[PDB]
Each structure stands twice: as C-alpha cells, then as structure tokens.
Design a protein around this nucleic acid. Sequence first.
DNA 1: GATCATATTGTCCAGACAGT
DNA 2: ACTGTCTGGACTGGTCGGCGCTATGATC
Lengths: 900, 77, 56, 69
Amino acid sequence: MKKVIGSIEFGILSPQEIRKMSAAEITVPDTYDDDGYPIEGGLMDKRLGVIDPGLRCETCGARAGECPGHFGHIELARPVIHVGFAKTIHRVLESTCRECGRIKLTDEEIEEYMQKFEVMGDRKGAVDKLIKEIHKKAKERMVCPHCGAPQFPIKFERPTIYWELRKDEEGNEYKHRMMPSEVRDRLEKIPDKDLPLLGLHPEKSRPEWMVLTVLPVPPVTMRPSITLESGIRAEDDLTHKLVDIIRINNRLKSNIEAGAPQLIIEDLWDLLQYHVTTYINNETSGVPPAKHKSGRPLKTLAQRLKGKEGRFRGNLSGKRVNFSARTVISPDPMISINEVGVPLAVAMELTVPEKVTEFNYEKLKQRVLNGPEKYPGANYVIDPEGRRIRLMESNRELIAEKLDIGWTVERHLEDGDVVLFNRQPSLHRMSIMAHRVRVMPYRTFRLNLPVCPPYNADFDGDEMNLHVPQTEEAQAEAKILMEVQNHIISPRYGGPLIAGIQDHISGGYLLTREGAYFTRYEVEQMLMFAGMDVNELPEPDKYENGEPLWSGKTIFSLLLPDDLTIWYRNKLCDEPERCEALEKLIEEKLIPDPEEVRKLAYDGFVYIQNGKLLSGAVDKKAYGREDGKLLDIIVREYGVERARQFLDQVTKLTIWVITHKGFTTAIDDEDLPQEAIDRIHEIIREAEEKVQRLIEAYKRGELEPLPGKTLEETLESKIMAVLAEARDNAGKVAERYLGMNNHAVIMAKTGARGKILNITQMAAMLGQQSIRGKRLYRGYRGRVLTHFKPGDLGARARGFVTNSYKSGLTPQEYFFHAMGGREGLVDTAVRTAQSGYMQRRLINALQDLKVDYDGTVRDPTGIIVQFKYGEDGVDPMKSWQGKTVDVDRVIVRTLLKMRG
Amino acid sequence: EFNIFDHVLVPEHRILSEEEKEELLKKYRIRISQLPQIKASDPAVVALGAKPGDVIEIKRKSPTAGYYYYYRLVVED
Amino acid sequence: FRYTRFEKARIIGARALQIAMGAPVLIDVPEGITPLQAALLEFEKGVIPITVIRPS
Amino acid sequence: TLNINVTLGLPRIIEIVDARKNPSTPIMTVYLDEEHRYDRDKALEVARRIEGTTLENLAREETIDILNM
DNA sequence: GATCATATTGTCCAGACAGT
DNA sequence: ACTGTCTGGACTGGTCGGCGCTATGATC
Ligand SMILES: [Mg+2]
Ligand SMILES: [Zn+2]
Ligand SMILES: [Zn+2]
C-alpha cells in the first residue's frame, strides 16, 4: 500500500553514518575534463548521480531527470569545528570537566534537575530556561565535584576559536589555543547520562559529532551543472566551495605525510576550517565571505534555506504551479457575480481532466473528435494504463473510436466550469474566490463590478490570476466553500463586501428619487435588460398627456421579496423633522396605511413595507459596501442565492437607468456665483488678518502659552486652527450654493464616488498644505521659498493655498501642493511594507489556531487557547453588527410577519 | 488598602477545589499541562493566596457573551 | 443534525472521486454532466451514502 | 495613516502586537475620587502632585560661575 | 605556436553582557 | 540590582520585460 510521514526526528549525522550513506569518496577537485566527460573521483562523478541526458548513473542505473542523486563523503585530514554548533561546543566545554569528563554538578543537583526535566517537557521555553540555568550553575564551578580536578575559564572567539586561560608555573595567565582535535577529544569523554543535562541526546546528537571529521558532499542533483550558449560550463557556488575544500584538504594531507613543521600544519588547518565555515554559512560574522573570481560573494547551504528566495519561503511555503493563467481584467456587468470571463485562447490551452463515465461518454468522445484546434475539444487523452497521449489531426479519430470507460480526457474549458480567481496581494481570504467559466472571444479576463471591492481591483491595467483545479476533491471544495455568493458578508466586520458601487448607487438614486417617472417602453426595456421575471406591468401610478407613467419606486419594489419590511435613515437625510413624522407614524400603528405613508414620504427616510418602497431613495446605505442595510438583511433573511439574484438584477436595472437617462459632469458643476466668490475671498482675508494679528501678538509677547507647549508651538497650533476653521467656512459657503441637481453633488452625497470636500477644493479653495502634521518649513533660512521674506510666519508663506483648482494655483501654491502630494505618496509607499510585514508576522503567529468540534480553540500541542471561540461561539461573519443575536430586528420582523 | 480586584480591568479570580478541578479536566478531556498558565508572582495569585498546581477560575466580563469563564493553572516563576 | 460546509465539501469530493473511477450513480442524471455535477445532484436528492464520523 | 503626542495608527498597533517593553510616548489616564473630580482646583493640585518637576525646567538659564567655584 | 594546475581568505528592536 | 554597550536580524506579495556576467599566466 502507501504510507505517510508521521513524525520527523532531527539530530547530528555521525561520521560512521556519513561514511555508510556515502556512495563514493571524492578526492579530485576537478569536475570536467577537456572533452566534457565527468572525471572519476571528482565532484561530478557519476556515482553521485547524473545531470547530462546521455549520462548513466553508476549507483542507480537510471538516466537524467529521474536519478535522485547520491551523497558522497570527504575524509578530512584534520577535524574542523562546525560553525553552526560553535556556541553549543563552547557551552558544553564550559559546563564539563576538562579531564574527568563529567558535568560540573553534584549528584543531588543532577537528580533534582532530572526530576525537574520530566515536569516541564511540553513547553520548549521551560526546557531552554532550565538548560541556561544548568549551564550558568556549572560555568562558575572551578573544581569538579566528581574528581577534584582544577578547571580554567574558556574564552570563545568568533567564529570557531576557543581559548583556555591556563596558569603558568609563576602564576602568570596565558591564553592557550584549543585545537579542534583537542576539543573533540574533550567532548568524547562526556558520558551519555550527562547529555540530557546539557541538552543533547545520547543516541541522536553526541557532543563529539559537532566537530566534523567527515564532510558529506551533496549529490549532483542538489548542485546541478549547466552549459552556456558558448559551451562553457557554469558550475554552482557549492561546487566551487567544495573544489576549494578538496584542494585545501589534499594539500594538508600531503604536508602531513611529508612531515611538515607544525607552523605549516596550523596554517593549513586554519585555511581548511575557514573553507568549511564558509561552506556551511558564507554570511558568518567576523569571517570574510567567500568570493568568486569575478568578485561575487557565493551563497551556500545556509543561504539556500533562509531568506525570501530560500528553500522554505521560495519553494516550500510558496511555489509556481501548473494550469494557471494571467491577463488584464476588463469590466463585464452582463455576467453574474458568480461568473468570470475566460478568453477562448486561454480556455483552449487550460484543460480539465474528466474521466469517461456512462453519463458523459458521448460528450467526451465529441471532445476527442474535435481535437485541440476545434472548440470545444481536447488536447490530451490518458488511457487506464496511465500513459498520456497527445491529440493531433492524425490520431484524433483512432483515439475517439478507442475511448472507453476509465479513460481520462483533458478537454478544453467549458461554460459552468469552476476556476479560482485571484488578485495580488492577497490581504484577506476574499482575495481568492471560485467563479464559473464564461468563454469570450477577446484576450481579457472579465469580472463583475460588485466583485471588485473584495479584490480591491480597478480597471486601470490590473492583471489577475486564474487557477483551474484538476482533481474532483479540489473542484468540489472550490464549488462548495469558495464560491463568490458564499462570501458576500465580510467576516472582518460582519457587513456586506460584495455590494454595489458608484454607477449602481447613482442609478438607484436616479430611479428611486422623488418625481422620477418612466414610460411603458422604458419600464419594459429595463425589465428585459435586468432579467426580471415580469410578464405583465403593474397599474400605472399616474397619467400625463394621456400616456401612462410608472414611478421608479414601483419598479424598484419588484426586486424585493414580498414579505420584507425595513425602515431606516439614509445619507440623504438633511431634515430630521420630516423623518420624525414617518417614525412616529410607523411606531404608533406598526402597520401604517400605504396611502398615509406616501402623503408624508421623504427621500431621506427609506421605508419598505411588504416589499414595496413606500418612501426614501437609494444610496450607499441601501446596498453599498459596509453600509447597505437592505442587502445585509436580504443575505441574512433570504440566503445567499436570493441575494445573488437580487444583486445581479439590481445592478443591471440601475445601469440601464443611468445609461439611458444621461449622467454627466462638466466644467459648470464647480461654477459659483460672484457673491459666493466674494464671501470666500472675505473669509480668506479675515483668516489672513487673524493670522497676522496672532503673529503680531506673539512678537509683542502678549501671546499666552498653552499648557505643555512653548510660544512657537502655541502660535503654530492657533494658526493651524484658524486656517482649518477658514477652510470649513469656505466649504460650507460652497456647499450652500451647490444643490441636489448637480451630478457631482449627487455622486458625493449618495456615497457613489468622491466626497463633499473633493468638490470644495475645486470650487472654493484648497486650504493649508502640511507635512507630518506641521506647516511647511523645509527650505531656506527662515523661509520655505526665496520669494517670501525671511522670518515670515504668515499663512501664505507657510503653505496656505487661497486659490482653488478652478481658479488656478500660483507657482508657490503649486510647489506647496506638490510637497503635500509627495508626502502622501511617500507615506503610502512606506506604510505598505510595514503593514505587509505585520500581516506576515500575525499569520505565522496564528496559523495553527482552529475551532474544534466542542467549540474550543487549541494549539497543535493540545493547550486550550479559548474554551469557546469569541467567548460565545459565534462566527464574526454571521454576527449582527458585532453582537450575538439582533433581538430587536428578530422581534420586529416576527411581529410584522404575524400581524401582516 | 486598595484591593486588586476593585479595578475595572481585573476580573474576578477564584481558586477551584480539587473536585472542581478534576471535573474541569474531565469535561475538556485535557491534562493539567494543557491549561493556560498563570505565574505564581501574579498580583491576583498573591491576593488569593494560591500556590503552584492550583487552577484559577476567572469570570471575565465578555463584550459578546456578558460573562465568560476562563481557567488558568498556577505555575512557578 | 446538520452538515457543516467543510463536511459537505468533503462528502461531495469523495462522491465525485468515487464516480470518476466507477461507483455508478444511484439516481437518474442528465447526459453530458461532470461527476461533480452528479455528486451535487445526489446530495440535492438526499441519496448520499457517505456519513461523517464525529468525536465523542 | 502614519504619524497630546499620542502617535496612534500603524506604529501603535505594531508596538502593541510586538509587546514593546517601553511604548513610544507613554500616556497615563488618571481618575479622581469624589473629593477631587468636581472642582478644577483639586484636580490641579492632584496633577501637580503627580507631575514630576526637577530643577532644570524651573531654571531660566544656565551659567557656570568660577569666582565662587 | 598548444596545454596545465591554480586560482586569497543601514535605522531600529531585542537579547546577552561588563561596569558601578 | 540598574545602565549603557555589543551583537544579531529583518527589512509587503505578485507580475511585466531588459541587460550583462560567470579564466589566466607559464612552459613544452
Ligand atoms: Mg489599479
Ligand atoms: Zn543515481
Ligand atoms: Zn571531573
């Protein structure tokens, strides 16, 4: 059968294990000869694997691409210290007797630590603290309790140098260098019983194994060799490092065999130690990194695992995948929110493997007969034996007549297929959702507009990735869990995320506003466009010139369910006295007459009774993101499919309404009368006079300092407050003369796009430009620009733009606005990286937490983090405004349903 | 003197009995080492006079559930 | 007793995998559909034979 | 958004989740009992009792004198 | 004129550590 | 027991494409 990995046990490889697992001994530094054949005994020996296609492995007998590679070994002439175990070696040497070999602890202390180790074993932090305490206790001891032999302090010098402070005959203290052979001999005397006290395992990690005597050379598959376009081989950095190691080891062995003096032996030993240390880690502190001939700092085994481009993050936690596509996205309101537009070229390339069954034999046979060049067709066919056959014109008929039950047909992407649609960066779980394939002739992806806010995607050149699941389990998981309609409500705040946007909101406002009426032709056309299942028109609301007319509220009410009742205040409510009468009428009777409601109907108060929009207008509070009460109620009380249908119908209806009525903005939308401009100029002049008076008072010393601040900050705060008040007054003056008939004002007030402040800047004035919360000061001595006098603290000299976008900015005001915009762009480009790093840290901290079947949240070890998730066991996605149950809404809905 | 439990941020702390601790362990099917830990030098522990090895029942003021029960095991510093 | 989304997805995936390599459909299905569609139809008809083991 | 003197935002949440031993610009919220929370004079004297005042802030200027050493 | 060995050894935050 | 100092580390994801660079000195 098949087996899976249950657990992984780590340790230090013994020299005997390295020798036994080795397939060959490497002694020749050279890799390839002049003819290009591998050299026997070299680093590219065929016993370690094969890279070239024509080569055959002497250990496996297989060809390139399927030989896994085999490890070698190098017999070092002298032992060397592993740089990754240097601190542990120093700690163990400090914590152990030099000649006796036992740990410098009493028997009672050893027993006490042995019993304490069993109690604290689950938490690795407790074990680390116990190890540190044992090391600290054993370090201060200068006499071994087991034998009474005197001890000397051991000094550790980076990277792998150990100094022993021995005492001379006259009492002088001199440093004695401990060679790796002496260190290994000292480590060999430690018994197995003291190893748990030192944090080592008797059978897995012996202390003497931390001093390397046999170096395992990696297989050639781990360090592949390529050839360039000019025929010159490009060896890996590990290959060059191993070449240097082999050369130095051979030179050291030859010098040892030649009886060289000890001075040469120490130099060669140090060179070999440096080479081994750089091979293990080329970024070790205090070590000059190994450099290539061209000057390139080589990357080694340590660099291949850590970092963004390491083995873990770059190849294990994340990697490139097959059956994926990426292209520019384009809007498509005609498709549903559950659908994605797939190009025909993309569909004809990406394939889904479908097994031949009894109920789909004819379809797959037709797909095979069509071939790869005829849509809908197939590209590959897999027999039950498991081999893959490519489909072409010559053999498409032979395969088609040979098709049977159990075959696999890699047909092209068809309508209704489930694929993954993703936009980067993936900040939340809504960044990847499963859509339905819709095949289109052009070369762009198509995404429905309400699905843009979950992706945070616009259409100014955005590109998105498409993934096609290949297994039945993955397809089922995508279809059940990751469908678009299943994630309308955002789990972050428990509100709508897949909601209407600017044009939908504007069209809804245009349709549902007071005085909006449509002819029979317009109503029928918008009903056909929206796909609503309406066969007969309702009774006309009024007649004009002998022609029937339908109110927009009547057309909008066809979308709502017949048993839906809700009332609230939208963003268009500017006269609360009109909403108060409606609220009192609703409260008094709880079933108000529809004629009575329409008599005192107000656009700012939306009231839906039994699915009929009796009052109010559609805005961002209707079905907008994070504010749509109607959409949120529809999701919670009618399911996700009904909500998806409602969204698909209402988006098309509002799009038709806004398209044929005519929505536009012009240069006269920001126009203001002369009296408004005069008032704005008067406000600006008054603010400038106030700033000048404050400056004069500060110069005369009459300014009262604020608590906790000196005169300069007090004056700056007063000036900024005055300028902000002036900007607010100018904005109010501009808002006074901009009525509801303005399309830009409609867009700002309905929440479709933009703000009132955006219209204020173009109409009245820009205001004060500031960076880092302070007025502009960077420039010359005492002045931002030379055009102003030195020492001028006035508003105009510090970044107060009196002009507006329509009036035209002065060059100084242009420079100030450029400073502000640069500050904003820099702030965004700096904040993004910190936010991403914090998100990665949080993800890695809370990756393993999940809710068990009993409602508890536990770590993989088993420690209970929460006895109930959220202390109430309620999903934030299904929570009503952060609460457990919306009691008032339930009571009101039940009472209305039973009394209606 | 100012009691440590009069603060709004400090929830009620109560030392569980032996039978109560055994019932709590049996209910969640966990060992004594799978519970959250509280240091013996904690002000609540020294106010209650508890010793390492006991389980403290904490009556949290839940913003969502009103009142929530949390359990912590006293451990040495 | 109600199925969770994860349990339903796992059941549908297992049934689709079974249908792909044998396991004839227990209900009538339209021709030309995928095994995933057949598993979804079986779940809609309430005819699935796969149960869920829960801790106790 | 990046950047009295409370410095909230992304740096604040970063400091919170990183369990910083000393947060940047610490702020202490101090409440008063029934004898001091009603009138401004009692609050002012409580604040001046809490606030730490040293000699360098009280001094107007610093001048080293050599005649008296 | 062809080949062959050899080719060198950037601020900030947090934990550990001499100094008083 | 505090306090300033030395050392280690990580520096948001994806995508697009381009542009170089991967021997040399001394015999026989
Ligand atoms: Mg964009
Ligand atoms: Zn092999
Ligand atoms: Zn000894």
